[PDB]
Structure 1
Amino acid sequence: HVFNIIGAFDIPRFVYNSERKKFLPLLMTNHPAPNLFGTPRDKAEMFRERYTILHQRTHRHEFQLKTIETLLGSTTKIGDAIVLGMITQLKEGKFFLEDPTGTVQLDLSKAQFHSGLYTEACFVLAEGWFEDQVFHVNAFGFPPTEPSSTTRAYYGNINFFGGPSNTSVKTSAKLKQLEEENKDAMFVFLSDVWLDQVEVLEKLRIMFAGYSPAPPTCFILCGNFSSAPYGKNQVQALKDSLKTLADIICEYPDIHQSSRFVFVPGPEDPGFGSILPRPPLAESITNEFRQRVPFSVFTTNPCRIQYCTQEITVFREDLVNKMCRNCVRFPSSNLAIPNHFVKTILSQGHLTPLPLYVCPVYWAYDYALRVYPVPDLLVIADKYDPFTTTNTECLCINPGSFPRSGFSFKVFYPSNKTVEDSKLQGF
């Protein structure tokens, strides 16, 4: 009840009801259950839900939005209009705006953008005028982000996050107590831990030695556990590497006996890593390691971690480059890319606010990639430079690629929501 690891495929599914205006448990609805191989309808619902979660959220912030069918209908020029829709590039350079009621040709040639990383498939609030079946946009913006407190105020204490509890953990004065008492609680995040590289192993030793006098609550080691996924034989190389890691962890009894280890797999690791959510590394691959290090769990990607009253979502993906390669335009340089980036993820309330061809997702399981309600800590382990930002009450960090960031990693003290950094390059 104090520390739970929730896999993507165990995330409680909720369906929004536009009528009762509430989120209902899957079995409490007439909505078909999810399967890996979905139906054409499922593929459509994927984006409908993405639109619906934003619509519902946006309708409460309050401006008068117009649907697209409303515009496509009109026989006259609609001077002013703000529409919530998804940007799609049907033809190169030709952009359109889509919503449940229809699609409309977009003219963004004179549009201005608020901060954020605007990409193909992002939902936006487009303000402008309409005439002759074309929507001329003056300004693009993102639907306003709704903080946890607000979501909780409207919907109650539904446990959207998942885990043992049947009610939100942010409403447990008991866990709040424990959370504030355990000031030494600490989570260490690393990414691209290439176990096949000698230097990576040497730096993990230094980390274990340095943490022995005060072993962290948990080490979250993120994916791409091999610097070389070409291989003389991939699966066995990974199994061998884990043997070495287990040996090193066992050589530091203080860490071995106190610290929990969580392994979040990357897109290049064995398994179906290129479609999300992806399952954990195969048990045949990890059995041996788990026998020597019983306090470990190999989870999905993304995955959710619940610690006392705090929600932590972890996602390993080279997301920033995907977003950049699919941008409508470059954001203004008066704000750093990670700040634009985080605004996007939270405003979209989704980890992969991109097209399926860019971020393949099992249609029926898209809801598992949601970032709403906003969590306490969002970890996007990316090969992109490390960073720590704070948007809408949510701490968002990226420890970066361990082997390529001078062996940098991030530390999170839950007691007072503080984030710290370390770098072992010089050793």
Structure 2
Amino acid sequence: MAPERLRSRALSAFKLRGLLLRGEAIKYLTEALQSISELELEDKLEKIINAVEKQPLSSNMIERSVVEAAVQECSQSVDETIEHVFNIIGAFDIPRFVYNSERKKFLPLLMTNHPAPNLFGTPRDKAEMFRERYTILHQRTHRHELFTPPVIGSHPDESGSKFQLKTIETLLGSTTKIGDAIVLGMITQLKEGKFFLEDPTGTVQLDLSKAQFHSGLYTEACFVLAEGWFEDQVFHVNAFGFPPTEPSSTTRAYYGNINFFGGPSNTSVKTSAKLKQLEEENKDAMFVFLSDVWLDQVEVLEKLRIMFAGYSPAPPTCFILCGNFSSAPYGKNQVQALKDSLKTLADIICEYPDIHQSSRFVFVPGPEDPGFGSILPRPPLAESITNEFRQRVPFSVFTTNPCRIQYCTQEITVFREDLVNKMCRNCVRFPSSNLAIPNHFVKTILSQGHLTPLPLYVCPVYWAYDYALRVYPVPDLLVIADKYDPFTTTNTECLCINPGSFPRSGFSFKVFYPSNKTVEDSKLQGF
């Protein structure tokens, strides 16, 4: 085709749509379109212009990179992809949204006055953690059926389905011995035995002589609906309860499909037709999850060899190895032992090259593993430890703890901490045994909407990064890796699972199939 007419028509095609091409962009475009004639040229131009406009364009002027991506997408090249299909997101990479009350909308921080998060936070940020936790739970609470009736919704007035809400500052006043007060607030043992409630407006004593408590494991720093009456600067509790939990369908139906989970997608990955198709392109799309994988033990390494033997047929897309990787985490000794662990793991992986090229391997280190273990979100394992594994197994990613894994349209959260024991020791009211403890824990986590519903000295967190620990909206998987007990539970279209601790589960572990969201037990105890 004539280069001058091809250039003129391509420039005109972009110009009529209001787009300007730089010299490199138009040159590359003419080279890419040189093999096409008038039977296809204009349709090709319209298609690639649509591909350009789909991208996050910041200006009418187009660099060569944008048209490169557009024409490559027009030429496919996304067949059997891993990008857009499987992402591991570090906790520091999660977008920092903030809920604005006047707009009643989540805004990204670039659209606000909020500063960037950093470890050495201000005195304000320490309060901002709990203030934002209250804010998210507050906007969650007021959208429940407890909301006031509409305009003459009932001929007699109703008290918000008998669940009308108030804050602490409102009842510090004329409302003495009002028998129907309900307040959202944080439980605190602000004096020993003399518990208090707190919200962003103020504080008040809790007379919890009767608790009448709904199922859930109550601790200090838990936010609760305290139902009771007020007298003598004391809130006399009639009942305690958590705020009701939302499904992600409800949350995204209200706020739209914002990508709260993070990752490359601008929208929530749960709503995408192409990604819905790519999720099911492999009927046995599959992942494996383990924890406390003590590779400083020869026994763990040999049993891992047997597990690779067992999953040579139908290998996963990725193996997920949660942390506390060591029998003996005790410093320099374990730095060298983890180097040896990863050398031996690379040897084993090269002894199964089919699994090496078929599966990825990701690591979520625990609080006891070497490095900045004790404060969350933990950074990844030290790069000097990983370096040989980086070059010998490029099909692997050491990442933060917690980390967010996305597989196509589904949301997986991975977090290593022995939190059930922490929660039950910081318990305010010993729960009823009729519901199992992992169900109590999962209900508490989902209702509190946070991975660490405990005081800061119980769960040390970098203050400005506390949003990364937030469970909101509810994901597809809560992979809470914990010594306590391997388990599987579910609520609000999530499956909340624990792979246990591999040396103490008798070397049992978990398997997950996102194509049908099923979970299977690797019951390989005699392996």
Partner residue of 1:378 out of 462, 478, 482 = 478
Instruction: Give CA deviations for 1:382-417 in whole Å, capped at 9, x if unaligned.
Output: 001100000111110001000011001001100111
Structure 1 residue 75: Cα displacement: 5.8
* Secondary structure, aligned partner of 1:368: helix
- Map 1:149-228 onto structure 2 (within 5 A): 149-228=249-328
Structure 1 residue 109: Cα displacement: 1.4
Contact 1:68 1:102 in 2 (8 A): yes
Contact 1:350 1:369 in 2 (8 A): yes
Identical pairs, percent: 100
Q: Aligned equivalents of 2:496 and 2:444: distance in 1?
A: 12
Contact 2:175 2:230 in 1 (8 A): no
Contact 2:364 2:401 in 1 (8 A): yes
**Residue of structure 1 in register with 2:102 after alignment:** 19
Cα distance change on mapping 1:232 and 1:264 into 2, 3 Å: closer
Contact 1:69 1:102 in 2 (8 A): yes
Instruction: Give CA deviations for 1:329-382 in whole Å, capped at 9, x if unaligned.
Output: 221111100001100111011100110010011111100001101001110000
* Secondary structure, aligned partner of 2:132: helix
RCO higher in structure (CA 8 A, sep ≥6): 1
Contact 1:191 1:401 in 2 (8 A): yes
Contact 2:176 2:229 in 1 (8 A): no
Structure 1 residue 5: Cα displacement: 0.5
TM-score normalised to structure 2 length: 0.80
Structure whose CA Rg is larger: 2
Structure 1 residue 74: Cα displacement: 2.9
Contact 1:71 1:78 in 2 (8 A): no
Instruction: Give CA deviations for 1:72-101 in whole Å, capped at 9, x if unaligned.
Output: 233622221111101111233221111000
Q: Which of structure 1's runs of 4+ aligned residues deviate more than 6 A?
A: none
- Structure 1 window deviating more from structure 2 (223-232 vs 286-295): it is 223-232
Contact 2:86 2:406 in 1 (8 A): yes
Instruction: Give CA deviations for 1:201-248 in whole Å, capped at 9, x if unaligned.
Output: 111111100111211111000101111012562312211111111111
Contact 2:196 2:206 in 1 (8 A): yes
Instruction: Give CA deviations for 1:172-211 in whole Å, capped at 9, x if unaligned.
Output: 1111112123211111110000111111111111110011
Q: Aligned equivalents of 2:279 and 2:427: distance in 1?
A: 40
Q: Aligned equivalents of 2:403 and 2:294: distance in 1?
A: 20
Contact 1:116 1:340 in 2 (8 A): yes
Contact 2:322 2:364 in 1 (8 A): yes
Structure 1 residue 70: Cα displacement: 1.1
- Structure 1 window deviating more from structure 2 (109-118 vs 351-360): it is 109-118
Structure whose residues are more often strand by fraction: 1
Q: Aligned equivalents of 2:499 and 2:459: distance in 1?
A: 22
Contact 1:190 1:410 in 2 (8 A): yes
* Secondary structure, aligned partner of 1:188: strand
Contact 1:203 1:424 in 2 (8 A): no
* Contiguous gaps of at least 5 residues in structure 2: 1-83, 146-162
RMSD of aligned Cα (Å): 1.0
Q: Aligned equivalents of 2:96 and 2:174: distance in 1?
A: 39
Q: Aligned equivalents of 2:227 and 2:349: distance in 1?
A: 56
Q: Aligned equivalents of 1:74 and 1:358: distance in 2?
A: 38
Q: Aligned equivalents of 1:51 and 1:273: distance in 2?
A: 27
Structure 1 residue 419: Cα displacement: 0.5
**Residue of structure 1 in register with 2:152 after alignment:** none
Q: Aligned equivalents of 2:521 and 2:390: distance in 1?
A: 28
TM-score normalised to structure 1 length: 0.98
